[PDB]
Design a protein around this ligand. Structure first.
Ligand SMILES: Cc1cc2nc3c(=O)[nH]c(=O)nc-3n(C[C@H](O)[C@H](O)[C@H](O)COP(=O)(O)O)c2cc1C
Ligand code: SF4
Ligand code: SF4
Ligand code: SF4
Ligand code: SF4
Ligand code: SF4
Ligand code: FES
Ligand code: FES
Ligand SMILES: [Ca+2]
Ligand code: NA
Ligand SMILES: [Zn+2]
Lengths: 103, 59, 269, 236, 421, 99, 62, 108
């Protein structure tokens, strides 16, 4: 089937970056899930979606998909470039600031 | 929905833990009664604390 | 383009001298705890969680978020300047600040939507002690009326002022401020009015604790249950990078994800 | 203590013409585009005119200086000399409670206030004419214990003397400020131990002498009491 | 000892004539033009040699601070800000200078401002000093009329403007960077350093902040001479100093004396001695609220100067003392300071916004004895978590008073716990 | 036992240089990384050698490492009741390679 | 009321040491499994009005 | 329930997270009064291993394993417990459950 190779992005709700180092090969859900009539649970016949592989480099993920005859898409990551402030903390008190800094 | 329990207090800050002995309630939290409405509700047990304005003593 | 060598713990690295120590540490892959600093907001320096040791400087720990590399006094003979993120001073400083952050914090994790993806929980686990010494009553705070998108539990606020800095600098509105003084200083909107901005939903992400949370999402899920899909938004032609969080058959919420060239890390309401 | 505006607010505020003139002069002390610097003095004048700082005053002064309302509200709540609710119409007694005044009998003075003015601070007396609060050091510690009423320091106090002072205010009088034990300003009791020869040159010290001349100790300032002068505008 | 001929503030009590003419009789505004024509370098070099040290609380060499200011203007004006906040709980020396001997402050402002190349100076006075500000403003207007301030200030060829700005009741606004924030129309929260004020201060322009007494002393040092000033006091502790004697002395007062005077001689000569005799002395807070308390025995040979107080593990501070006799509850005295610092913290940064309240509430229980003895070491540990970890030195100032109590009066704390239990 | 296990690892590395790729002592346990072609010879030496008498085979298992060129590790756990010591032997195996 | 005593959990019988009861408690029921009062899930075919489930609202033509 | 009659569960989902057998399923919304409460609370009693981890994880003593063990059923679906079934068990067994909590409190 089709697998996704991508680098998971930082969770916006948190500032930590430890869950952004690894590449993952994922088997995205293949068919719709259903509602169990008896209890309302989420039913599925797609056990392949249980599989989630973890790699250190994009090459390792791409290799594995090739050796195993998997059609894959590689989604490139969007690293956040450092916002280098030329004056650093001092720009809060620059004489040419549009408005006073709020602290 | 009516409150399960109302207590009238003379302080603007109250603590609720479910009123249960030695670790049988809920985590102990401090609640602030607004001066506008005069009541606050516990997020764990839904107990409502209502200020007694005439006797309400500022700390 | 005159890169400067700096030694962080045991890593020698070459960086732009205008970088702050916290930016240099991330470039070296060294984790530094933080609450008030954000990459895209003005440096505040108020949480004091990012304190590091500058070898050879005064015994005071230095806030790594506010100290540029060029401010470090060069090492003897021109050796690279050294900063420690692992020393006993740093360990004690982080434990002390974490203790101060928790003495007045409410015991709300079970009823707080941040639970499970909370920087306060996670850094308290990694950088604080496992017990309490505080035996006094805790502070209790009144909540705000910010409108139908942001629910407030201001007793949880840790006074990082991220919300104030985002709404003022990025959203371009002047409704939020910090009134009063001391431990009774309150983050607030003027006249307790609802925020008027189609960018306001971003403060839910920025708030490190469950002080500012999403009303529509409130109580419906925990972070560990959600399946995450990195996708592209179509509500406008900007094509913002987003994360769609699903549980079973339903989308549960929509979060921004970073794209420096399109939407940075913001989305509209 | 939470710093909040009073729930009951006047409908509007307006500077008197002479106070609006005075405020505009204050804005000329600071460089172009820095007129927001005058927020504290201008907010102070609004309180002096009305006796307390109301919301329309804060918004009026923010508009005058081109500040956001939240920015002006932050100033009003951060600085504790601003009264965000009505105080005693006649006088508001501020008693120092810090250490030096505490070990010289400040707490006994606070007991006098509770008996005569009101059981709790910031609370109006039944008349609505007097209120009190405890404050931190007023920088007159050699004259401890001391209190501030209106513009003036009443110094070297005692329960008997403070009680008598409150009685004179209650009768419509303004007792003489300054040391109440006969001292001049801050020299040792019983004559200066230094610079002793100068005695006699002035009847009262600078604070008392001005208070007696102008009689604005507890007076609502309308701006026509002191001429408005801007000598710095000539320097350019 | 110091005699009237050597006292710089010669009308400190305001007993003599307070008019501008009366000030000129006392030698003020005497040859101001000549001093200024000596140039910037000579004035700074003289301030360096005089050995003056900041009288605001930290004692940093004043001339050195003046030499951080840029020599050429890069487009941004320079500023001198004179610190008249004086909200330290025992400190009242500056009140006298502003209302009784203002012309010492005004002339020093002009000379100091010229030395830094500043055309404007701002005095930040606390809002409670309403009559001091009215009196100081009247003197500034006299000087403007006489030509001592303005287009060609005192005939020196320097355009100088002096403005008076007042606060509204915040002790943190005396901190140098918080002052600039307050002066700009903001709530007075300190800034971290860097940037340093000499680089970016008021309006993001180079600024120097000096205490009132630091500036008011300048003209006399330049007129009489740097060597004369350095004659008084011990080496590295030069000059004459205004002292505040407060608390349980017979005659509390403010007086000018030489540096490095023994504490006892100061008290007995000008304070009239301790209430009930020297043997009634219990404790002394030597330099304002933020100075660790001293026992009765440590005060025996204490020398009132920067090195003397440091040697006793205390601080010289502002040199205004709180004298407590044997009838005073010292734990209650230090507790009321903890209540003061809790009341004054700006709330910006975590260790002080949260730490000061915690320290205050533990101190309150120690006053009553409602504590365990292990909480004394716990409290000492908490103070160490605040000290050195905050943005500004108020965090440190809130920890030192408690640390001094534990170091010097621990047995008195342990007695209260035993007494109650 | 830490010095003992390091000494024992040198003895094995010396006597079976070509079998042994490396040795490690972590958490008080000695692990020997061996080549696939020499694993049987090495385990035979460990069983019979006087200093290291590993005559009890505790178990054999595998570990999957899909990110690695040789995805499988085969792990041999051996015990010596006479010397009172343990050892682990690890060999890296590619998919479809024979062991 | 008697379960704890009968299973030796508590020493004293409810006659001597009665159990405290809250006003919102409900009377005891035996096992009802083979009867019509047996519990069944809301979607059970025993219910005869099984609760219909959905997680989206469908558009209705005018 | 609390002594005041309100439900103890506040839909924190710690029991659902710790459950080794994934026997618990929870859905929650803000109640009409704004309270944090569940709308679904299912325990699959044929998945449950009766380990008691859920009652250890619960911060408010909402979910407990009670003293009853004689509830064998004639059909399998009678062992799919929904929220009302579990609450009914709590209202009938509260007196014994509360006493057991008091007896074991010194060890918890
Ligand atoms: C909390 C705090 C309050 C301060 N208050 C004053 C003050 O009231 N007056 C003063 O001159 N310096 C005060 N200072 C010291 C100033 O920060 C600064 O060091 C000083 O004004 C510099 O002037 P100087 O070197 O001439 O003494 C304070 C410092 C802190 C940390
Ligand atoms: S903000 Fe974090 S630490 Fe605070 S109650 Fe919520 S989950 Fe717990
Ligand atoms: S509400 Fe949140 S973002 Fe705003 S100051 Fe408080 S903790 Fe920071
Ligand atoms: S130490 Fe206290 S006064 Fe200083 S910046 Fe921090 S919170 Fe404000
Ligand atoms: S007792 Fe049952 S429901 Fe509770 S955690 Fe264990 S398996 Fe899950
Ligand atoms: S039963 Fe307890 S642990 Fe489970 S969701 Fe409810 S409160 Fe949380
Ligand atoms: S991240 Fe540096 S002080 Fe907050
Ligand atoms: S302690 Fe009261 S005026 Fe200073
Ligand atoms: Ca309710
Ligand atoms: Na948040
Ligand atoms: Zn409760």
């Amino acid at each position: 089937m089709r697998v996704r190779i991508y680098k998971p992005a930082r969770n916006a709700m948190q500032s930590g970056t430890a869950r952004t180092r690894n590449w993952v090969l994922d088997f995205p859900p293949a068919d719709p899930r259903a509602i169990d009539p008896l209890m309302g649970w989420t039913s599925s016949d797609d056990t392949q979606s249980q599989v989630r592989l973890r790699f250190e480099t994009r090459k390792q993920a791409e290799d594995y998909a090739r050796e195993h005859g998997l059609d894959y898409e590689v989604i490139e990551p969007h690293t956040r470039a450092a916002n280098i402030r030329p004056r650093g903390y001092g720009e809060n008190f620059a004489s040419d600031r549009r408005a006073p800094w709020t602290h | 929905i009516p409150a399960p329990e109302i207590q009238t207090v003379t302080s603007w800050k109250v603590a609720c833990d479910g009123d249960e002995a030695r670790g049988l309630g809920h985590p102990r939290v401090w609640l602030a009664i607004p001066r506008d409405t005069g009541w606050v509700e516990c997020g764990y047990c839904d107990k409502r604390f209502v200020i007694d304005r005439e006797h309400a003593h500022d700390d | 383009a005159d890169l400067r060598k700096i030694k962080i713990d045991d890593t020698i690295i070459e960086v732009d001298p205008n970088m702050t120590l916290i930016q240099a540490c991330e470039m070296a892959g060294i984790e530094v705890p933080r609450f008030c600093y954000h990459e895209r907001l003005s440096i505040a320096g108020n949480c004091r969680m990012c304190l590091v040791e500058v070898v050879g400087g005064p015994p005071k720990p230095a806030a790594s978020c506010a100290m540029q590399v060029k401010d470090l006094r060069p090492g003897p003979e021109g050796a690279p300047s050294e900063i420690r993120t692992n020393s006993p001073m740093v360990k004690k400083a982080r434990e002390g600040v974490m203790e101060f952050l928790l003495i007045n914090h409410p015991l709300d994790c079970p009823i707080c939507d941040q639970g499970g993806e909370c920087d306060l929980q996670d850094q308290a686990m990694a950088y604080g002690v496992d017990f309490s010494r505080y035996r006094e009553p805790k502070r209790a705070t009144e909540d705000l009326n910010l409108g139908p998108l942001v629910e407030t539990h201001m007793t949880r606020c840790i006074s990082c002022t991220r919300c104030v800095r985002f709404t003022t600098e990025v959203a371009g509105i002047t409704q939020m401020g910090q009134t009063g003084r001391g431990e009774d200083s309150e983050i607030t909107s003027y006249l307790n009015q609802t925020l008027e901005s189609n960018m306001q939903g971003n403060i839910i992400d920025l708030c490190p604790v469950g002080a500012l949370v999403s009303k529509p999402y409130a109580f419906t899920a925990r972070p560990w249950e959600l399946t995450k899909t990195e996708s592209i938004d179509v509500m406008d032609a900007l094509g913002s990078s987003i994360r769609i969080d699903t549980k079973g058959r339903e989308v549960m919420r929509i979060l921004p994800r970073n794209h420096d060239g399109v939407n940075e890390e913001w989305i509209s309401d | 203590m939470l710093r909040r505006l009073s729930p009951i607010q006047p409908d509007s505020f307006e500077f008197t013409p002479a106070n609006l003139e005075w405020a505009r002069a204050q804005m000329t002390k600071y460089p172009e585009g820095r007129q927001q610097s005058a927020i504290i003095p201008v907010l102070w004048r609004a309180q002096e005119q009305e006796g307390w700082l109301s919301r329309p005053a804060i918004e009026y002064c923010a508009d005058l200086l081109g500040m956001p309302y939240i920015r002006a509200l932050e100033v009003a709540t951060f600085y504790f000399m601003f009264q965000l609710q009505p105080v005693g119409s006649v006088a508001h007694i501020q008693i120092c409670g810090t250490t030096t005044c505490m070990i010289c009998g400040a707490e006994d003075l606070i007991r006098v206030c509770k008996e005569k003015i009101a059981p709790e601070p910031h609370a109006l007396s039944a008349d609505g004419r007097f209120s009190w609060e405890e404050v931190e050091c007023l920088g007159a510690c050699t004259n401890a214990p001391m209190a501030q009423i209106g513009k003036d320091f009443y110094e070297d106090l005692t329960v008997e003397k403070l009680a008598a002072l409150i009685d004179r205010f209650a009768a419509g009088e303004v007792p003489v400020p300054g040391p109440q034990n006969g001292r001049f300003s801050a020299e040792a009791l019983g004559g200066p131990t230094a610079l002793a020869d100068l005695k006699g040159g002035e009847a009262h010290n600078a604070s008392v002498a001005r208070a007696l001349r102008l009689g604005d100790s507890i007076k609502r300032i309308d701006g026509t009491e002191v001429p408005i002068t801007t000598p710095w505008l000539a320097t350019q | 000892m110091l005699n009237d001929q050597d006292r710089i503030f010669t009308n400190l009590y305001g007993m003599g004539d307070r008019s501008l003419a009366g000030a000129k009789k006392r030698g003020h505004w005497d040859g101001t033009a000549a001093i200024i024509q000596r140039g910037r370098d000579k004035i700074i070099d003289e301030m360096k040699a005089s050995g003056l040290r900041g009288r605001g609380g930290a004692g940093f060499p004043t001339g050195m601070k003046w030499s951080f200011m840029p020599k050429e203007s890069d487009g941004r004006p320079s500023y001198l800000v004179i610190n008249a906040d004086e909200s330290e709980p025992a400190t009242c020396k500056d009140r006298e200078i502003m209302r009784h001997d203002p012309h010492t402050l005004i002339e020093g402002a002009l000379i100091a401002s010229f030395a830094m190349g500043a055309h404007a100076a701002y005095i930040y006075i606390r809002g409670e000093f309403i009559r001091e500000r009215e009196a100081l403003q009247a003197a500034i207007d006299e000087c403007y009329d006489a030509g001592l301030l303005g287009r060609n200030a005192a005939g020196s060829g320097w355009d100088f403007d002096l403005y008076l700005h007042h606060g509204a009741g915040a002790y943190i606004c005396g901190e140098e960077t918080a002052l600039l924030e307050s002066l700009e129309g903001k709530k007075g929260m300190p800034r971290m350093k860097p940037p340093f004020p000499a680089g970016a201060g008021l309006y993001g322009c180079p600024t120097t902040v000096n205490n009132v007494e630091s500036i008011a002393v300048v003209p006399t040092i330049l007129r009489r001479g740097a060597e004369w000033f350095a004659s008084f006091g011990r080496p590295n502790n030069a000059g004459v100093k205004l002292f505040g004697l407060t608390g349980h002395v017979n005659t509390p007062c403010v007086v000018e004396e030489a540096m490095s005077i023994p504490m006892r001689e100061l008290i007995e000569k000008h304070g009239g001695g301790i209430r009930g005799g020297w043997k009634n002395l219990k404790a002394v807070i030597p330099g304002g609220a933020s100075c660790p308390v001293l026992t009765a025995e440590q005060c025996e040979n204490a020398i009132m100067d920067y090195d003397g107080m440091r040697e006793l593990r205390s601080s010289f501070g502002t040199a205004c003392m709180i004298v407590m006799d044997q009838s005073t509850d010292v734990v209650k005295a230090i507790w009321r300071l903890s209540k003061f610092f809790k009341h004054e913290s700006c709330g910006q940064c975590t260790p002080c916004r949260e730490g000061t309240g915690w320290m205050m509430r533990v101190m309150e229980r120690l006053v009553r004895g409602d504590a365990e003895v292990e909480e004394i070491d716990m409290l000492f540990d908490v103070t160490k978590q605040v000290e050195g970890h905050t943005i500004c030195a108020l965090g440190d100032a809130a920890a030192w008073p408690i640390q001094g109590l534990i170091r010097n009066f621990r047995e008195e704390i342990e007695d209260r716990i035993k007494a109650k239990r | 036992s830490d010095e003992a296990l390091l000494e024992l690892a040198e003895h094995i590395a010396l006597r079976r240089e070509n079998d042994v790729i490396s040795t490690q002592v972590a958490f008080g346990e000695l692990t020997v990384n061996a080549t696939l072609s020499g694993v049987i010879g090495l385990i035979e030496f460990l069983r019979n050698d006087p200093n290291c008498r590993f005559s009890t085979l505790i178990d054999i298992t595998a570990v999957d490492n899909p990110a690695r060129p040789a995805r499988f590790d085969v792990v041999y756990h051996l015990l010596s009741m006479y010397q009172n010591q343990r050892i682990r032997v690890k060999v890296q195996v590619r998919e479809d390679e024979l062991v | 009321e008697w379960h704890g005593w009968l299973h030796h959990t508590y020493k004293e019988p409810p006659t001597a040491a009665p159990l405290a009861h809250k006003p919102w408690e409900k009377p005891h029921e035996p096992n009802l499994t083979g009867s019509s009062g047996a519990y069944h899930p809301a979607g059970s075919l025993y219910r005869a009005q099984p609760v219909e489930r959905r997680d989206y609202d469908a558009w209705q033509p005018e | 329930r609390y002594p005041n009659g309100e439900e103890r569960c506040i839909a924190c989902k710690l029991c659902e997270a710790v459950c080794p057998a994934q026997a618990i399923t929870i859905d929650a919304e803000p109640r009409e009064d704004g309270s944090r409460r569940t709308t679904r609370y299912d325990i699959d009693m044929t998945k449950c291993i009766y380990c008691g981890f859920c009652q250890e994880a619960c911060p408010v003593d909402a979910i407990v394993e009670g003293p009853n063990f004689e509830y064998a059923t004639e059909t399998r679906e009678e062992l799919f417990y929904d929220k009302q079934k579990l609450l009914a068990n709590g209202e009938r067994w509260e007196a014994e459950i509360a006493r057991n909590l008091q007896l074991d409190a010194p060890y918890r």
